[PDB]
Amino acid sequence: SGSGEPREEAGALGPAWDESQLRSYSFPTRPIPRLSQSDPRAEELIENEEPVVLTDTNLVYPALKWDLEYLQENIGNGDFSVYSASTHKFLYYDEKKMANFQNFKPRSNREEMKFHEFVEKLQDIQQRGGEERLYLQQTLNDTVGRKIVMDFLGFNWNWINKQQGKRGWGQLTSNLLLIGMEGNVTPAHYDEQQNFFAQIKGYKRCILFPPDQFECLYPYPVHHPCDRQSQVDFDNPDYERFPNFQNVVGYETVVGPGDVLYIPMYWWHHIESLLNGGITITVNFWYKGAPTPKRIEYPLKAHQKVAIMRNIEKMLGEALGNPQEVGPLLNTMIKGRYN
Amino acid sequence: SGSGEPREEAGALGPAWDESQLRSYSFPTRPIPRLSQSDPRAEELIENEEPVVLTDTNLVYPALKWDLEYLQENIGNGDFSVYSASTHKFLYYDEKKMANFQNFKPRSNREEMKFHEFVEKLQDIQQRGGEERLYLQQTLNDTVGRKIVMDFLGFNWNWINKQQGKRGWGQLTSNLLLIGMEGNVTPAHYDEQQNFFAQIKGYKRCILFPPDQFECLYPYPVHHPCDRQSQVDFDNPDYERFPNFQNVVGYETVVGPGDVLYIPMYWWHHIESLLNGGITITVNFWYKGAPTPKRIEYPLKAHQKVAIMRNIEKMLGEALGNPQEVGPLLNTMIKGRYN
Ligand SMILES: O=C(O)CNC(=O)c1ncc(-c2cccc(Cl)c2)cc1O
Ligand SMILES: O=C(O)CNC(=O)c1ncc(-c2cccc(Cl)c2)cc1O
Ligand SMILES: [Zn+2]
């Protein structure tokens, strides 16, 4: 199944999307549940750190009127990070780690520009039917214009603050605004914080994998610039290098305006703006996970084993004085001894 | 080369041993230098933590008269640990770690007995030409008889205490008495302390490998009872499991009465009592290595990387709550990511 039958928009406006707008992949999926925020099952899913789509939170209700016109006239004159790409895949590159791998070629290039400059490129590209793609990813702070501040104040802080308290999460670390073009793909990766993914404009297909599928998704080394992302090309998986990708099973859903997807900490997510669906707008909310208990029940959670692996890789990097010696030492430790 | 031409005993007594008494192995070797304790080159070798045979230390001069008769009549009535074996290989088993591996079969069995009982078995075995083998390995403390205490006090403590101070080593941790039968083999292993190997009776072939040949020698897992020993059977090496054993290069020498072999910390050693050479007697001295400097020069020593690997394996054992999960997690961390 996976995404399921497309939903019918109110007023008999027809289906919001069709299967032809979803890309084709090699793995099966099951659907993420779409529930009401008042449904106790949704409460149980979040508490158990499983994904759920909430349909009626009103989390970003005032932002549902947002489009390029409204934002350009009200966002203000500030710098917005804009990422470029020659293809549909926007692989992230941590610039601080580029020193560790010298012969690493970045595929996407970040650019700072005012918002009207961002709209111009989209208009310019659209005019000449170019194959270039863009993706705006900028934090929203107090600098933005007055009208956008009013909208932000109109978010449902009552609800999201309640969730913060119920789950004992830490503080809201950041709120990121995402504006992308149709067809854009953010490849599979995991984050170390709890995420509420608030869709505003357009539709996004979200494919999630639990932390226990670490073995099938082959993240980059911790010291690599692409740390936390899968090495597997979902469009052309190299089964000789990544054989357990043939065993991957995902959770998917299509989110539209007004939906909020809970992406639990350490869960992989692969996100694409539907083909031929126009631009997409999203706001993300990240919260630090709850602290680790004093006494651990044992039979450790998958995310706890991922955290251990990350720490091993980090400690060796420092202890050996060079991140490039991590791989050779780990292989020495394993070959003919644990494998 | 390796052992080199056998030495000529004084008084034209002929060669002390011949090549026919050495076992045959698949790897090459170079000779350990035999030097005088007054030779500054020997001082440089110890300081640089490289093996050397010292010919004239008088370290255990009073013990050179030791044999089974003398010891039985003077050692006293105490318990001596005696290890048994069905073959010539005496693989060590840490009894405290046997819990971690349940389906582990021990090949040697320890036995407590008085010294005259130990001589009786050697006499009994010799009588019936049995294939069983024995090895006495007991610490020497103040309980032993008066004459043996006098001999121990007659060791060259002036010299060995000077070495302790020069190298900044820690305290003498223990002194072990080793009495074995001809043909006995102590398989390749490394220790975490500095060792002075004082040969008393008979001849032993010592084959040493530097710490940087860790990759070729495939030690057991840290939590295995045979921790610190090589998995490779030197008599029948399994090159499919242990391919880099085909690249091993060793340092060897034959030690006789009055020789002292410095075995540096973390150096592998394989030790065999020569075939048809009678019983062998040895006393070992272990000293804690010097402390780790505050500021490390970097480009780390091979023994420092071994220590890191040991600590990783130990930390994971505790962190995961089960030593048997160490291997699976390490493979998960490496497969398709670092290998
Ligand atoms: O939502 C999408 O459509 C795709 N984007 C992400 O998934 C994402 N994930 C994480 C981050 C991020 C960036 C910086 C810090 C932190 Cl804690 C998180 C940004 C991100 O854009
Ligand atoms: O010398 C031989 O002929 C073979 N024996 C060893 O190599 C040896 N090595 C280490 C120990 C040992 C046993 C207990 C504690 C410590 Cl620190 C060391 C005993 C040992 O017997
Ligand atoms: Zn993310």
Ligand SMILES: [Zn+2]
């Ligand atoms: Zn030893």
